[PDB]
């Protein structure tokens, strides 16, 4: 099974993520299970950083 990304971290891909990366300087991930989105900036998502 694939585990949720920890709080303050975001999945590297919108679907079928392979690694979890920390939110960069100046960003913050409130919720766990954050994931990046290709649309818009590559460092943010609907719940991402």
């Amino acid at each position: 099974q694939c585990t949720p990304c920890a709080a303050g971290f975001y999945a590297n891909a919108p679907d079928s993520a392979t690694s979890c990366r920390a939110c960069p300087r100046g960003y913050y991930g409130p919720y766990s299970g954050a994931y990046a989105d290709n649309l818009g900036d590559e460092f943010e998502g609907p719940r991402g950083c």
């Binding site: 585990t3 920890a6 971290f9 920390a22």
Partner: peptide
Amino acid sequence: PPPPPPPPPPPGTPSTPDAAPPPPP
């Protein structure tokens, strides 16, 4: 004969990574 028991759950998940003008004449 009775059926065998169920296997023990896997170990805990891993943690997370770290961080002056001149005077007049």
